[PDB]
Structure 1
């Protein structure tokens, strides 16, 4: 495993990624894997949802996007805060992935005409203001701070801070694997989108829910699932989880 040890050490010389990742390069139990971090001086929901934000590191404007469900990053140093350039970058996000809804604030950096045209052409919905759960915004701001610490480290390696911003984007996409089972943002992204296509396909049995309180039976309800203790059904826009011994079964 000396080759694996050398490879993991080089990886930390380049990436300083999570020790959970480096356990893979070591191909060794965690006890040694902690040593690379210990010795390291700088160390020791719908798939179509995205959010856009901004930060002002070192007097420059950095606009960052995150896929909420997986900790993915898409970022670019923007020359100016004008809505025209944000429109171009939102065009990029929309082209590269099937993005359905975007959560930003009400500011003119997003309510400008160009952004509205971008959403109109690409087919994206946007929210303007405070989301119902600003803890997600707090999480992405914490991610912004972690990217900033990352930058405070990488800037030893990049002559231009913009390039270090990109370097961080990639480090967090792939090298910094963690959470659940130590997975990179790329892995979660890919798993989520494959799940999404299989769920489009998933989206011959109908049920007459037997409302014994009348007593009466409901009409041609659909069977969204036949669990073990209950049988979900949908009735127009309402989804009523019926009792498993009080649901008729019609085979179509």
Structure 2
């Protein structure tokens, strides 16, 4: 309301974002966001994050390759000039470099079974699953994303001078400012939160092994001599929990030395 209406309408004629985004970001009442949306003539599954779906479509006489994340709905679309397995391999290695994907869902197209695709998936260690996907929910998400991207591309084609620019603007508005129907958050935020909350077991196990690799020298309350190389479990501000021949001991920080004997 502190001149937020003008900036909101500017970013809506430039972006055409959802009204929840206008309400949350610019701190304006929902009525203003709804009327801004109305004023625009162009507007009216929890699983493993390693699952992605890749598809190709023919729009405006050009071939578009779209990769979608199953767990969050994040999308990445590119315009491929000449349909060749080399460009499909390029897109696959790009998405592998930018994301730790582990499983890709594709149909039985000629370019999907190319030798370059097989080499890339074998080198990157990515599981390949051809054929119809087993989850109708993923297909429904694919259809919804396809229709939404078609609509936004039709809306934004007037601003851009090339199809690639329009596709990139569409993916930018979808990923960052657009808010999904569940929770009302951006797709990029959802996918980044899922990735952040996904890498927990590997780091937990590696930290456990590393903390067990440590060596501790401790003394008792009335014992002036130091003990042997007790394995380390947990370190605290003033107490340390260690193992010494299948015995759990809590030692004050004053009488404990922590070392990694390199030799």
Q: Give the TM-score category using the shorter length.
A: 0.7 to 0.9
Aligned-pair CA distance for 1:219: 33
- String of CA shifts for 1:69-88, please: whole Å, max 9, x gaps: 11111111012222111011
Count matched residues: 252
Flag structure 2 segments of 5+ consecutive residues without an equivalent: 205-211
Aligned-pair CA distance for 1:126: 1.1
Aligned-pair CA distance for 1:210: 41
Aligned-pair CA distance for 1:93: 0.4
Aligned-pair CA distance for 1:107: 2.1
Q: Given the superposition, is the C-alpha separation of residues 4 and 226 from structure 1 closer, same or farther in structure 2, using an over 3 Å criterion? A: same
Give the distance between the partners of 1:235 and 1:128, measured in 2 at CA. 53
Tell whether the 8 Å contact from 1:7 to 1:25 is kept in structure 2 after alignment. no
Aligned-pair CA distance for 1:215: 52
Q: Which SS does the other structure have where 1:50 is aligned?
A: strand
Tell whether the 8 Å contact from 1:107 to 1:128 is kept in structure 2 after alignment. no
Give the distance between the partners of 1:130 and 1:231, measured in 2 at CA. 55
Alignment of 1:81-92 (within 5 A): 81-92=83-94
Aligned-pair CA distance for 1:8: 0.9
Alignment of 1:1-252 (within 5 A): 1-44=1-44, 45-201=47-203
Aligned-pair CA distance for 1:42: 1.1
Aligned-pair CA distance for 1:4: 1.5
Q: Given the superposition, is the C-alpha separation of residues 34 and 85 from structure 1 closer, same or farther in structure 2, using an over 3 Å criterion? A: same
Aligned-pair CA distance for 1:33: 1.8
- String of CA shifts for 1:24-66, please: whole Å, max 9, x gaps: 2441231222111111111121111111001100111000001
Give the distance between the partners of 1:51 and 1:57, measured in 2 at CA. 19
TM-score (norm 2): 0.74
Tell whether the 8 Å contact from 1:8 to 1:26 is kept in structure 2 after alignment. yes
Q: Which SS does the other structure have where 2:37 is aligned?
A: helix
Aligned-pair CA distance for 1:179: 2.6
Aligned-pair CA distance for 1:194: 1.0
Which has the larger displacement, 22-31 or 58-67?
22-31
TM-score (norm 1): 0.77
Aligned-pair CA distance for 1:222: 22
Tell whether the 8 Å contact from 2:73 to 2:141 is kept in structure 1 after alignment. no
Give the distance between the partners of 1:164 and 1:204, measured in 2 at CA. 54
Which has the larger displacement, 59-68 or 194-203?
194-203
Give the distance between the partners of 2:135 and 2:247, measured in 1 at CA. 24
Tell whether the 8 Å contact from 2:79 to 2:163 is kept in structure 1 after alignment. no
Q: Which SS does the other structure have where 1:66 is aligned?
A: strand
Flag structure 1 segments of 5+ consecutive residues without an equivalent: none
